[PDB]
């Protein structure tokens, strides 16, 4: 009898001051807010029902109305920022944190869910949820000897909410909150549920998306080997955040990059650099570009793992945004690599796909490619072999393209393209 009420009828029941009439109107509101087709969230808000729902959260003597109002508020909070703000403005944050201690599992789970929606709105509400003290009772729900004893959906909701507490930048989450959460994240990262694993990886990817000090907090917990293992998962929803975290880590110091290499990550990149999902190839190639921007011994590990032919492959054929990352990987490679490493790069056939990408109507990748050509010529000068490279570039049509770039509009494109020809093709 609570199906398809009007908002007016819901208001009538909630204003009735009959607890059972209030409970049924609240359930009717929950069912209204649970429909896929355009749930009347704004009409419920404008009816002034949020403070009433929040008040119902505190009725410990009537657990069903706590549950129904928590569910109704969860779905309002899952909407726009203005709709989430209406829930927060109703005082729902401390009420939901109090419900985390509920003896009813389905009620505390709803409070977990609601706080995840609120924290997921942005850094402001995230930090406000933290200031209200949500982390201690949330982590206390996971303080069991074995996570497998917890209900699966319950554990998935807790992991997701914890990930939203790790989410967003400007500012990043408070340092002490991250330290408080991380040991539980590491444990969730070893759980055997695919959705817990995915959301745990997402949380780690958020925490590593920052300066080296943030990356270091994660790396010192020793999770890089587990991240590398999850890099090899068959589930794309796990590989994607695991790869984002690995890529974030290698934006840090050479020592942090080395932890990724030491853990065996490069052995997965033959598959990642040919992955059918465009986003995986792009992320994997971007990651490779930050590894080839490392030390010469790290460039050498890329060589030993047979990854240069795979970089030649993505440069030859990939989505353009992936080919752009491949161009960066080559320019970084030639900028920091030894003469012998650069020679090997030419031997793998980098020149022709490099030249072909000078056709691209992207002024930055042209600058990137021209830089790599200069770097390769500089290594050819140290060998006295610039003539042979000049022949290679012309034979594949590269010099025709470089000379067309002399009439290019953007400045450093045509300055650099004349310097190449003036010096090596003249």
């Amino acid at each position: 009898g609570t199906v398809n009420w009007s908002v007016e009828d819901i208001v009538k029941g909630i204003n009735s001051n009959n607890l059972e009439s209030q409970l049924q109107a609240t359930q009717a509101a929950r069912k209204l807010l649970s429909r896929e087709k355009q749930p009347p969230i704004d009409n419920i808000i404008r009816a002034g029902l949020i403070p009433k729902f929040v008040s119902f959260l505190g009725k410990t003597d009537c657990s069903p109305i706590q549950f129904e109002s928590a569910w109704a508020l969860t779905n309002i909070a899952s909407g726009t920022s203005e709709q989430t703000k209406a829930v927060v403005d109703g005082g729902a944050i401390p009420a939901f944190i109090s419900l985390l201690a509920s003896p009813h599992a389905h009620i505390s789970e709803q409070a977990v869910w609601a706080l995840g929606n609120i924290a997921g709105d942005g850094s402001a509400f995230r930090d406000l949820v933290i200031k209200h003290g949500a982390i201690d009772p949330l982590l206390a729900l996971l303080a069991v000897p074995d996570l497998s004893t917890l209900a699966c959906g319950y554990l998935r909701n807790l992991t997701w909410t914890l990930s939203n507490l790790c989410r967003n930048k400007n500012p990043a989450p408070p340092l002490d909150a991250v330290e408080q959460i991380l040991p539980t994240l590491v444990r969730l990262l070893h759980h055997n549920d695919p959705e817990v694993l995915a959301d745990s990886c997402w949380a780690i990817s958020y925490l590593t998306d920052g300066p080296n000090e943030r990356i270091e907090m994660v790396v010192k917990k020793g999770v890089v080997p587990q991240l590398v293992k999850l890099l090899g998962a068959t589930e794309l929803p796990i590989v994607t955040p695991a790869l984002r975290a690995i890529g974030n880590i290698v934006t840090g110091t050479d020592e942090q990059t080395q932890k990724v290499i030491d853990a065996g990550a490069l052995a997965v990149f033959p598959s990642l650099l040919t992955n059918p999902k465009t986003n995986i190839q792009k992320e994997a190639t971007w990651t490779m570009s930050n590894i080839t921007a490392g030390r010469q011994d790290q460039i050498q590990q890329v060589v030993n793992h047979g990854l240069v032919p795979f970089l030649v492959g993505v440069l030859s054929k990939a989505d353009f945004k992936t080919q752009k990352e491949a161009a960066w990987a080559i320019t970084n490679y030639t900028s920091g690599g030894t003469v012998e490493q650069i020679v090997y790069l030419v031997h793998c056939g980098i020149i022709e796909p490099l030249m072909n990408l000078l056709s691209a109507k992207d002024t930055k990748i042209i600058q990137v490619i021209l830089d790599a050509i200069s770097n390769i010529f500089q290594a050819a000068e140290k060998l006295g072999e610039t003539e042979k490279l000049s022949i290679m570039i012309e034979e594949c049509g590269g010099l025709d393209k470089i000379e067309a770039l002399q009439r290019h509009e953007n400045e450093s494109v045509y300055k650099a393209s004349l310097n190449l020809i003036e010096k090596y093709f003249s």
């Binding site: 807010l33 649970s34 896929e36 749930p39 569910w71 969860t74 779905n75 909070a77 899952s78 909407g79 989430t84 709803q110 869910w113 995840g116 929606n117 997921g120 709105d121 997701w160 939203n164 989410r167």
Partner: peptide
Amino acid sequence: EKRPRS
């Protein structure tokens, strides 16, 4: 990410 309960 926000999630409604359907």
